[PDB]
Amino acid sequence: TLLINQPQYAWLKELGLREENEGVYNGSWGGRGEVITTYCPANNEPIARVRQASVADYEETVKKAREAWKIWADIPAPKRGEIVRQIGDALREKIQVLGSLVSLEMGKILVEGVGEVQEYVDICDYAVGLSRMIGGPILPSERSGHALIEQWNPVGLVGIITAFNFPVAVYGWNNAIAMICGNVCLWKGAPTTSLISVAVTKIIAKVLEDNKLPGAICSLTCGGADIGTAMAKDERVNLLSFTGSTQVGKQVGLMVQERFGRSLLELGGNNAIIAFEDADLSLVVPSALFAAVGTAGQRCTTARRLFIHESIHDEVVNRLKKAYAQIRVGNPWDPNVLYGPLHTKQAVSMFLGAVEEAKKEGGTVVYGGKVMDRPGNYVEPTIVTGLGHDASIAHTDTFAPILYVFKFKNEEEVFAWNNEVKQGLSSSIFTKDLGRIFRWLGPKGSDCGIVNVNIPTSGAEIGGAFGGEKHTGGGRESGSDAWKQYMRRSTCTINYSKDLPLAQGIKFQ
Amino acid sequence: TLLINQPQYAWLKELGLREENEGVYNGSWGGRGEVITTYCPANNEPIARVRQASVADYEETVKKAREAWKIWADIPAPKRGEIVRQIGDALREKIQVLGSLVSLEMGKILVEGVGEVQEYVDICDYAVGLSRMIGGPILPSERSGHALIEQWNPVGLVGIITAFNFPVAVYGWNNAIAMICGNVCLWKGAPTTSLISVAVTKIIAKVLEDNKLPGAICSLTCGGADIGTAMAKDERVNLLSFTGSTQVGKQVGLMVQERFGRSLLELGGNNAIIAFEDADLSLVVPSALFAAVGTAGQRCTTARRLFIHESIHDEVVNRLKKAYAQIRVGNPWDPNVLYGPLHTKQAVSMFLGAVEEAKKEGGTVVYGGKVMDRPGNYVEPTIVTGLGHDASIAHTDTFAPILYVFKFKNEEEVFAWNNEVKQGLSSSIFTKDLGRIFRWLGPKGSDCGIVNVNIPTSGAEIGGAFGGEKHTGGGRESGSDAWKQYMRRSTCTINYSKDLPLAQGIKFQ
Amino acid sequence: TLLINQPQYAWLKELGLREENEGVYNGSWGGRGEVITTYCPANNEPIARVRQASVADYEETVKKAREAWKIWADIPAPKRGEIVRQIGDALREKIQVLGSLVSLEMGKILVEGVGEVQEYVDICDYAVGLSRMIGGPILPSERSGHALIEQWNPVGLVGIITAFNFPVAVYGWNNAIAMICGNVCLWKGAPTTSLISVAVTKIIAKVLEDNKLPGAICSLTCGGADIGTAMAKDERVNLLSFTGSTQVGKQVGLMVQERFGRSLLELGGNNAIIAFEDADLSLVVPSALFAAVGTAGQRCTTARRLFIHESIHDEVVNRLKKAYAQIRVGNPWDPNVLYGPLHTKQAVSMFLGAVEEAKKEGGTVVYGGKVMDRPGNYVEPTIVTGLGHDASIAHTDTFAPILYVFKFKNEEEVFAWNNEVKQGLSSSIFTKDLGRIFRWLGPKGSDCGIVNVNIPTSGAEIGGAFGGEKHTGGGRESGSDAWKQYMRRSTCTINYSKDLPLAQGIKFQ
Amino acid sequence: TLLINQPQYAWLKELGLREENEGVYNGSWGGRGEVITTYCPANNEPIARVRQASVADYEETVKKAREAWKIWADIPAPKRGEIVRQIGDALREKIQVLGSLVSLEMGKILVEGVGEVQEYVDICDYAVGLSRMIGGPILPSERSGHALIEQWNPVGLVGIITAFNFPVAVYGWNNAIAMICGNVCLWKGAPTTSLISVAVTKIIAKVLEDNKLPGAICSLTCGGADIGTAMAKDERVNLLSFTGSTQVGKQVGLMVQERFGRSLLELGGNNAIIAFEDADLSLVVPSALFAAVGTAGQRCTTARRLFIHESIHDEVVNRLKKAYAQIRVGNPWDPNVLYGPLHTKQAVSMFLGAVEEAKKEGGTVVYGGKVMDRPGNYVEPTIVTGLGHDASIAHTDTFAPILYVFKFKNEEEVFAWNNEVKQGLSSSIFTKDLGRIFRWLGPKGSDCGIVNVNIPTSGAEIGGAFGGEKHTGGGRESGSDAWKQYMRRSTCTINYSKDLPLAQGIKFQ
Numbered sequence A, B, C, D: 001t002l003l004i005n006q007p008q009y010a011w012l013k014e015l016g017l018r019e020e021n022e023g024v025y026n027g028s029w030g031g032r033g034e035v036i037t038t039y040c041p042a043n044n045e046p047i048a049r050v051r052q053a054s055v056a057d058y059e060e061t062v063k064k065a066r067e068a069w070k071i072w073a074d075i076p077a078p079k080r081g082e083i084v085r086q087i088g089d090a091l092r093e094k095i096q097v098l099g100s101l102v103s104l105e106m107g108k109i110l111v112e113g114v115g116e117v118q119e120y121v122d123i124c125d126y127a128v129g130l131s132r133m134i135g136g137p138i139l140p141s142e143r144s145g146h147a148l149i150e151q152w153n154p155v156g157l158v159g160i161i162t163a164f165n166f167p168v169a170v171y172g173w174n175n176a177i178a179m180i181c182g183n184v185c186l187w188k189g190a191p192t193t194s195l196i197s198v199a200v201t202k203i204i205a206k207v208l209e210d211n212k213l214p215g216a217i218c219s220l221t222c223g224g225a226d227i228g229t230a231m232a233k234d235e236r237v238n239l240l241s242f243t244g245s246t247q248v249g250k251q252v253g254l255m256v257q258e259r260f261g262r263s264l265l266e267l268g269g270n271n272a273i274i275a276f277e278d279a280d281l282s283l284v285v286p287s288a289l290f291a292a293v294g295t296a297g298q299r300c301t302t303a304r305r306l307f308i309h310e311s312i313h314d315e316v317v318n319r320l321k322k323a324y325a326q327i328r329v330g331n332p333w334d335p336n337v338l339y340g341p342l343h344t345k346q347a348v349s350m351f352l353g354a355v356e357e358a359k360k361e362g363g364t365v366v367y368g369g370k371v372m373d374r375p376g377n378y379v380e381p382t383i384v385t386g387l388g389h390d391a392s393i394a395h396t397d398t399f400a401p402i403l404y405v406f407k408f409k410n411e412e413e414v415f416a417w418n419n420e421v422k423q424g425l426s427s428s429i430f431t432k433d434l435g436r437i438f439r440w441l442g443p444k445g446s447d448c449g450i451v452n453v454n455i456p457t458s459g460a461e462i463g464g465a466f467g468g469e470k471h472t473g474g475g476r477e478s479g480s481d482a483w484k485q486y487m488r489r490s491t492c493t494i495n496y497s498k499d500l501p502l503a504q505g506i507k508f509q
C-alpha cells in the first residue's frame, strides 16, 4: 500500500529511501520520536515513513554538531568549499530523481522540482568560489605602527527551519553558504516533506563520510513545532534561519532576541504585479500566469495582487482568463502538466475559506473558485475582481492560487498600494517608461527586497541576495554578501610598534 | 546658583545654552514635558535646566520628521554628504567649548571631551566620502536581456537612543551615517546629558536651516524612558539604534521585533586585557591604566578584567599601582587633569557596593577602594586581586573604576575565560608571539566584536565597524559597511528584452 | 603693458601672482630656465610671466620629492587625507578668484572656470573618505595556519602632465588621489597655463607649509616638451600620468614602457552623440549645444559627431542652428557669456583649415565656419552636414568647435559608427527605448570609457572613474577604484604555524 | 623511436595524442607550418610531432576567434562559468595523464605536474564563482533623476603566450578568467611543450563541442617567435597576456603599446629568501630547499638569493647541505622522485656557465656544481657562498638551480638588498618579529608583487592576484580582482528625467 513498495515508484530507492527511514542524522542515523507517514498530494496515497526526532535525539544532535564544529572551523575555507563542490556534484548526479521526489512528496510539477534542485546546484557552484573570497578589508589605521583588519569567523551552529513549499532550495541556500563560512548546520524541515529532507541529508552525509568528516557538520532532526521551538530557544544555536509563516516567524524572532541569539527570518509575501498602460501585454499575461499559478500558487513569491491600469484592465483580465483555461492539470510528474495539487488537504480548506471570504468582502470570482472533482488536493486557479485594494482578504497572505485584481490610474497611488501591506518580499512593474522604472527602483518606489521590472515576482536567480522587508522579516539568503549573516565580524587593531598613540590624538598624560 | 549664571561658566553660552533650554527640536524648538535640571558631577552643582518632550511633543516631532524625509530622501547622496561636511565644519569650529561642556555635564576629562567630539568630526569626514560610494553591485544575470542590480535605499526615520557616557560620539556615528544614507533622525539622549544633546542639536539645526532644509531631518526629543519606549513601539521609527544597558536593550530589541522593525543594539561590555609572559610590559601598564581608568572607568569598552600570566602577575600589578598613584585628580574641564568624577552619586554608592562585594567573594583591594575626600562624585580607581575568573562580582555590569585581576597559565584557558562572559564587546591580548596573535584573531580566538593586540580595549578609531557580539547586541556603527544597517537592500532584475526566459532554465509552457 | 599691472586685474594678487613668478616649487621657489609670458586669449594681451624649470631645476626637484616621500609615505593615510581636506578648504575659499584666472589665462567662461575648480574641491572630499578605505581584502588561505592579505602601498613619485584645456581639474584628480595613496607629486602643466599652475601650487604649498610638511610632496616644474620627455624617461618617476594629445601620449607610453615604468594615459576623444527617432528632442538640442560649444569645443569630451536618425535629422539640425544663434559671445569673465575665445592663435588657423577641408570633402557649413572679426581668438561655433560618417576630416580629432552631423537608420550600424574611430573616450545615446539603452551599455554597445544616456558626452562627475579606451590610452582618474593605479599591489602570505603545507596539496617530502 | 609508438607510453593516447599531431585548433584541427618534434628532457628521446601554425593558419584562426566572440560575448556570464566548470571537471578527470605528459615533455616531477594541473582546476572553481559576481558598483549620482553605473564588458580576443616551465597552469589562469569575462582566447605555448598545449586544447575542445559552442573560443596556434610577434602587432588581439623573458616581454609591451592594445606582462624574477636571527630554522631549511630545488630551479618564483643573518649563516648553510644531499634524483615520471632534469641541454650549458662564473667571482661551490653522469639534462642543484650581494653572477636571468647565499646584519640593508634587483616578483622573510613582519609588508618593505612570511617564494595559491613589479612587467593573473584586466570598464550615466542638471552645478545659461 505504500508507494515506495509499488513497482512504478521503485525509483525512490535510488535516493536510498525505504519503507521506514531514519529522520535524525548527526553522523549516526536514528530517530526516537513519532513515526510519521508522508503522503502524495496528487493522490492522497502514503509514500514512505520517517522516524522523527525525540527530545533526546535533539539534545544529542546539538552536542555532536558543536563538537563537529571544532574540527570543521579549523578546515580552511577553500577546502570547505571543496566539500560543497562535492555536494554540488552529488546533487547534479541525482537531480532528476530528487526532482521527482519533490514532485511526488511536495506536489509541484517536475520542471519546478528539478529546477528547485538546480537552485541548490547553482548556489553550490557559487559557494565554491566564495570560499576563496570571504573576508574583510585591511584598512589604513590613523595610527602609525598599527594595522586595522576586518576579520570574519563562523558563528558556530546554524539552525535551519524550512517550509513545505521549497523543501530543497531553501536548505540548499543556507547549507552551502553556512558550510563555506565554517559553520555546522542543523536542519528541521517541514514534516510533510520529511522524505525529501532525508533524501537530501543522505546525499550530504555520504559526502561528509567519504571525506572522513564528522557527519554532524550537516545534521538533521525531522520534527514538528516542538523541535523548531527548541531551536529558537536554544542558546547553542548561534544563528537560526527560519523560513515559514509570518505568525510563527515573529515568535521565532522574539525567542531568539530573548536569548541574544541571531535570527534570519524569511517570511510571507503579498506580492504585487503592476501593469501600466504602456506595458508589453505579451509579457504581462504569461508573467502573471507563471507568477500566479506556478507551484499552484504556493510560493512566498507568488503574485497575489495584480494592479492593472484602467485602460487595459478588462483586456488583461480577459486575456488572463483565456490563459487559465488552457492550463494543463494532472499528476505533477506527468509530461506537459503545468498545474498540480495543493500540498495538503488543509491548504484546500484554506483556499475554500479565502474564496468565500473574498465573496463576502464584495469580490467576484471571474475564474475558478472551486475544489476540483478528482483525487488529491486539487483546486482551480482563481481570479477575483472588484475588491478594494485594502480589502481584508487581499491584505491577508494565503498559500492558495487566488489572484486579486485591481484597477488603478496613477503611478503614485499604485506605488503606495504595492507598499501598503505588511509583507515586503517581491514586486514587479510592467512598463516601458524609463523614468518610471528608476523611480520604482528608488526611495519612493517599491519597499520590497525583490523589485522586478517586466518579469514575474517569482523566479529569482541565486546571484543576488534573496529576502524581504517589513513582516517578511528582513533576512537575506544566497548571493551578494548574504554570507555575512552567517559569520561574526571583528574589527581588529594590532599595534606592532613600541609606541601607544591613541585614537583621535588623545594625549592621556 | 545655576552654573550657567556664574561668570566663570559664561563659556556655556558660546553653545547657545541658556538658564532654561528647549529640549525638543523638529525645525522649531519647544518642550512641554517635565523640566529637568542637570548637575555638574565634579561639584554636585546645578548647571541649567531643559524642557523635555511631552507625548504630544513626541507625536508632532515624528510627524514632522517623516514629512522632512520626503524632501531629504529626494536629495542626491553626494549633496546630503555636503550637509554632513558642513556639520563636520561646525563641530570643528566649536570643538574646544563643546568638549568643555562634555567635561562639565558628563564629567570625563577635557582631552576625552575634545577627543569624543573629534570622533564625530572624523565620522563626518568619512561619511562625506561615503556619500559618493554607497550602493550595491551590478551583477551578471544568468538570463539573456536581463540586468541584475542590488539597490540601497534609506529605511526612513532612524531613532537614536544614547547613553550618558558618550553623549556626543555615539549620536554622531549614527547621525553622519544615517544622514548620507538619506534617512531622517530622532535623537533621545540620556537625561543627565541633556545640555549636551541640546548643544549638539543647536549646532546641527543651524547647518540644516542655513541650507534652507527642514530641521526635523535631525529631530531631538529630550526625555526619559517613556520617550525611549515610545520610539521602540513606534512603527514610524524604521530603525532604532539603541546604546544603553543590556537589560533595557533586550527590552528594546523585543519591542522592535514585535512590530517587525529594525534594531541596532550596542549594549554592555565586560572587556578583558590578557598579558602573556612575552608581553612588552611597557605597553601593558600604560594600556591597562588608560583602558581601566580613562573616563573614570565609565566606558562600555573599559577594561574590567586583567588576565596576567603567573610569571609576570605580581610585577605588572605593582607597576599598575605605582601608575595609579601618579594620576592627577581634579576638575575634569581643568587641562592636565587625568582623573575626573563618576557621573552620579548613585554610581559612587554602587562603586562602594562593588568594592564590598569583591571583598565578600574573597578578593583583595591592593589599591583604591574608597571614596575620595573632595566635593563631587570622586572615587579611587581600584584594583582587586585574588579573585577567581568566575567570581560573581567580575561577571557583573558596572560603570565603576574597578579592575579585576586574575592569573592564568596557558593560552587556551585564557582565551576561553575571555569568552566565558555574556557580553562580547572588546578584548585585547599583549604578546609578541606571531601564531598566538593569529589564533586570537581566528575562529578559536576572541569572540568579541573588537579584537585588539598590544593596545587597550577602549579607544577605537571610526574607520572600522564598532560593536559587539552575544549580549552586546550585535549592532555595528561607524565604519566598514555598517552603513548598510541604515538602508534597505533590494535585489532588482530588469527584463529589457521581448522574451521571458526563466531562472534555472525552467520551461513553463 | 601686463594685465597684472592694471588695476582692474588687481584680483590676480589674491592668488599671490606677480609680474614675474617662480615656476619651480620643491619646498623652495625658483626657476632658471626660460621665462614664459602667457597671454589672455580674449584680447591677446600679456598677463604675467613665469620662470620655467631648467635641467638643474628638474633634477633638484625630483631628488627633493623623493626625499620628501620617505616622510610622506610614513604618515598614516587618514592623516594624509586630513591634508587633502585642508587643500579642499583652501580651494573652496579661493574658488572665485581661481576660476577667474582660469577664464583669464585659459579662456573658458567663468561658470566653467568655477565649475572646474569645484571638480578639485569635489575630489578632495572624495579622497578624504577614501583615505580611511584604501586597501585590499584579507582572503581565506587554503593552507592551515596561513594568512593571505592583499596590501597596497604607494608607488612613490607620481609625475602629472596636464594640458591647457583643464588646467586645474585634471591635476586635481591626480593630486587628491595620489596624495591619500601616499605618493609625492611632480606637476608639469601646459606652458600656456603657467600662471594657473603656479596659482594652484601656491595654494597647496601653503597647506603643506602650514602643516610643517616638505613642500616637495607637491612639486612643480613648469616647462615644455623637454621637461615632459625627461619625466617619461626618468626611472625616478614611478607613475607618469599624461593628459594630452594621442600622438604625444603614444611616445610617453612607449618611453615609460621602455624603462618598465607605469603610465596613465588620458588622450584624445572623438565623441559622438546619437539621437534616435524616439529621442526627447527637448533633451537632445540643449545637450548637443552644451557638448559641442561648451569650452568653445576644446574638451577631450566635446561632442564632435552628431548622428541623427533620418526621420528627425532636419528638425534637430534646424533647432540646433536656432540654439547656436542664441549663444552670447563675449569676454569669458563677463556675465552670462556662454561662448569665449579659443586658447591659441594656432587653434584659429586649424579651425579655418578644418572648415575648408570639410567643404572639400563634401560637407555643407549650415552654421558658423568663420572667424569672428573682434579682438581675441574668437571663431564661430560651426555645424557641418552632408559628410559621410567615414570622411577623413571627421576622424582626425582637433579642438576646433566644429560639429559633424550624420544621418543613420539602424541601431546596429550607428553603434558601429560610434565605435569605428580610433579614440574611445565618451559617447551618448538619446532614446527612450529600454532595450536599446541596455544594449548600448552591453558588449555590443559603446566601446568608450564613458557611456551616457540622455546627456552630453562632456560633464562627468567625480564619483566614477574617468578615462577612455582604444587610442584614448586606457588610464582612469578620479572615482571608483581608480586609486589603485597610483599604488602597487602585493599578495602576502603569512605562515604563523609550525608547519609547511604546500599549495595545491603538493607533497614534497 | 618515438616514445608515443612505444607500448610503455600508450597512456599518451588517453590524451588524444598521436605520432603526428595538429598544432592549430580553431574549431577544426590543422596546421600548415613546420613540424616540430618535442623531446623528453630526461632521456633526449623524441616523443611525438606537432604541425605548427603557418602565418595563414594564424590569420584564419584570429578571424574565426573574432566571429566566435560575437556568439560567446552574448552568452550570460553565469552560463560561461558553466562551460569553465566543465573544463575544470574535464581536467579533474585527466589530472594524472596530463600531469604525466607535463612530467614527460617539460620534465618537472609528477607531484608538481599534477599540482600544476590542480592550479588550473582550482582557478576554474574560482572563475565559476566569479561568473556570477563580475561587475561594478552602482554609484549615487550628484544629479537628481540620474543613475550612475560602472559596467564591465569583455575586451574581445585575449592572446595568451606562455612559457616552457608552467606549460599548463599559466594558460589556465588566463583561460578560466578570460572565458568567464566573455572573451575568446588564442594560445601560443612554448614550442618545446607543444604536446602539452595540444593535449590541453583537446580537453577544452571536447567541452566546447559537447556544449554546441564554436571551438575558436579557445583557439590554438602552436609556433615560435614569428607567431608571438604577430600577436603582439595584431590590433585584433585586444589583450595580450605574455609570460616569458624580461627582454622579450619588453619588446612585446612596446609592440602592444605602439598600437594602443592592452598588455599583461609576467616576466622574470630574482627572488630572495631572507632569514633573520630569530627565524625558526626548522621552517627555513625545507622552505629554502623547496623554493630553490623545486622544478629543478626553473620557476620564475624560484629562490635564487638566500640572505642569512651573520649569526646563523654557517648553521643554515650546513643544514641546507644535508638537505641537498637527501634530494632524490631520477626520472620525473616516478610518483616518488624529488628532482628531475633541466628542460633543455642549453640550460645545462647556461648552468655550467654560471657556476664557473660564480667561482671566478670569488664564490665557493659548497654543494653540487656538476653535470650528473646520466642520460638527460641533469645538473646537481647548487649552493654558492661567499659572494657579495651585488656580485654580477647573482643578478642574471638564468633558470639554473644555483642558490646564492649572502650574509647580512640589520633589517634595513637586507630589505634594500631584496629591492636592489631589476625584477620584482617574489620575496620572503623568515622571522618571528611582529614589527618586522608588518614593516616588510609596508611602504619601506619588500617591493615585490608577492611578499611572503615564513614560507617559500614559490607555490602561490590562486585566491590572490599573481605577478610582480619593476622588470617583472606589472601584470596580474588569477585571483582577487585580476579579472578586471580582461575587461573594459565603462562609467555610465543615465538621465531618466526630463531635466538637464549639469555636474558641478554649472548653469550653462
Ligand SMILES: N[C@@H](CCCC(=O)O)C(=O)O
Pocket (backbone or CB within 6 Å): A119, A165, A166, A169, A243, A298, A299, A300, A301, A302, A457, A458, A459, A460, A461
Ligand atoms: N526561487 C524561488 C524561491 C521562493 C522561496 C519561497 O517561496 O519561500 C523564487 O524566487 O520564487
